[PDB]
Amino acid sequence: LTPEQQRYLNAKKYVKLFLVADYIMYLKYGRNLTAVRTRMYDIVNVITPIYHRMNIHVALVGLEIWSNTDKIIVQSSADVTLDLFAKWRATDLLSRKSHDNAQLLTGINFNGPTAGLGYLGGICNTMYSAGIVQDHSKIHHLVAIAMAHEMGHNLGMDHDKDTCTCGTRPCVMAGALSCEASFLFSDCSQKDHREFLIKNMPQCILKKPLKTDVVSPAVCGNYFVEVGEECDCGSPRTCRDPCCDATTCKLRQGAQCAEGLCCDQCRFKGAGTECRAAKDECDMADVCTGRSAECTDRFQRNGQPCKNNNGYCYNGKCPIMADQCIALFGPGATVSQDACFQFNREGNHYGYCRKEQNTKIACEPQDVKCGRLYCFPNSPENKNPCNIYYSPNDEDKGMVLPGTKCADRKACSNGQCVDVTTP
Template identity: 45%
Template sequence: LHSPDFYKMNLCVSQCVCRLLVSLQDHCYYHGRIISDSGSSVSISTCDGLRGYFRTSAQRYLIEPLTADDEGDHAVTTMTEKNFTPAVCGVTNTSWSDDLEPPTSRSRSRSAVRPSRLRTFIALVGLEIWSNGDLISVTPPAGANLEAFRKWRNNELVKKKKHDNAQLISGIDFEGSTVGLAFIGTLCTENSVGVVQDHNDRAIAVGATLAHEMGHNLGMDHDDSSACACSGDSCIMAAALSWNVPRTFSSCSSTNYDRYQSQRSPSCLLDKPDAKTLVSRSVCGNGFMEIGEQCDCGSVEECTNPCCNATTCTLSLGSQCAEGLCCHNCQISPRSSECRIKQDDCDLAEYCDGESPSCPEDMFAVNGLPCNGGQGYCYNGQCPQRPSQCIRLYGPSATEASPKCYNHNTRGLYWAFCRRPSNDKYIPCQLEDIFCGKLFCHHGNENPNYGRMVRISDCKAAFFSDYIKDYGQVDTGTKCGEGQVRHRDK
């Protein structure tokens, strides 16, 4: 899928930047199966001739044009394991980054947006080609490339185009057998990047590597081959790329992805593209409702929705809708039907309007309303409390530390303070404000899920190097005294 303001950017010989608004070609990418061969798969492009990949139960083939002429001769070659060089991902640390932002979005809202596991659509919003020299230093060490690209993206690319993730494909031969590297669980953050080596003549193999590295950004670890299974001969998140190019994620990847979403709640995943903003031609059967479609439940083989005609992507006879929290038995629910129940003290119920199959936007109670029996105050739909923050930081067995630990906040040290206006300035708490500063916990995991731990006796605190993203503090909106709440700057 392309966004309407998709751009392609070339760097000219004169060092000028040529921004090209691309007039997209008619749809020319197809995938499917061979009739009567359940073990087959096909992925073909008809742009400028036929090129792509198809597989039968017995063999794999590549097809590509021999000339630039659309109607010229084409070559079909058999894929063999001859001269195959093993390629691996350079990711060895299977934990999320220390300085990751903790989850802030409400996971309940996510469940209403994501209809099934791994059902995630990716819209290409831009392509930048460095045709007259690299804009960063690209060298054989993959780790150095990843860090350089991360910095360039945050300093330059984010200013050019709004996006959630960026991947660098390079012709430089990375050190050893490494062909890709990415940060784990960093989507929607400044570390949402990966680097991929153009390591194979088969574009599908490089594409599989890019999918693998993006999988890391989505919180997926490498598969344990003894415990993970997928529908293909190999799985996308295998640590090494096999000769049989993977096309599917494993059961372990699905579990990792679900865990990442529930624990981190990356907010940009909730920004489902509006079908009206996509300019590529509608493709019936891709599972995404686009302009001109009333519904899209996937291919004829995949569709299980009785409200949708999978062949035409139109509503079945007598149906008013095919999906949505206000769609029941293919009919739009009556006005005032509850479509999202009240979850807690800080939530509000939502009701159908009788016209749309979608439930209205999730709303919450006004900030400052007492919640959880007076233990907290509502803040942006949540009831933030210190004990639950300790669980988030150190795991389910963690508890809040004893009140005496909070006395450290009067010291104004890097691990105990109330305010931090810069990286090296720590302002102590007044005695009456000690519960509004650094969060102190006890028990739980040895190290925090994010940040770095500082332990003083039975008092555990989390330290962050960046004062702007110091999430070891008591959360904003948390009750820290009668009539008192923690504020980011106070």
């Protein structure tokens, strides 16, 4: 592995789940919205500890009930419904509520013995981080396991086969519905999922949700501080935090904090102390305010020469045209010769500098290095020296990232090559 891979695997995971309940669910629970939410909370309350054994904390960030009419056409075909649900999420849900993954809890019966369906490895994706689960049984922990199963597939896991085991009982990723299903993941799932994160490093599961963005009732002992709680270190038997009274999820007497790089023996660290040290050339070691328990990640002032003077620090990162190119057209790609950027002087369709409202502005002679990026899909053959990455859905994609080095001591700001405001 690499320094970034292993560093990622270590980071605590979080799945900001958005749950949707269809019109059949609303009817199923006697047209009582509270009853439908309580059902979803019960389900999440089971999913959460299940995913703790996988270094993931499922947090309910959104909830919606189609008590008026379904936003899509929920149907017997699991395939059609899933497709319809994902798209609706991509185009309607995400636009008004950010979240990492959505699950449709429907009361309809899917054709066949299947109780759910989901996109393999679609986690975090704006178009595929979705799954559908049939509220197939009165016993909610079984519905919970099914949803955890679909979430599993989203997380790169495949059905358990031959050798795979987790004990004397079926595991979450078992191929079919078994009422003896346990809450454990098999070694195989452990592995396939490990590999999966190693291969794609989905960024959205690193963001811990604010304790105020989590809409499910607080659960003391689920390893996550929620509204109404000062700390959560698990049950009293497993709680290792001496600052936390595990029984009440409240700080013990005399404690100001429990966790944080700015907490120490239940007390804030002195205003001045250093909590997090710089991770790279563009990051800067942080300090505690003596007042808060948290450590704000401050970065090295933007415009700081970085990556062997091939760019400049921009909010903790070092944007480089070369990286952008290899990121847009894969390995081997290189930045197009300078003459190619003259195409940004057209303000035509793909070549322009910025957007007033929706109207494209052409790059002035000195700003061509800040409009559309030009690369050379490196096959030494490729005759055409200029190539761009364009998207109809979002025209910004393919433009030179802000803060990108466009000349000595110069980086793009808003479609303009301007001098670093640093020495």
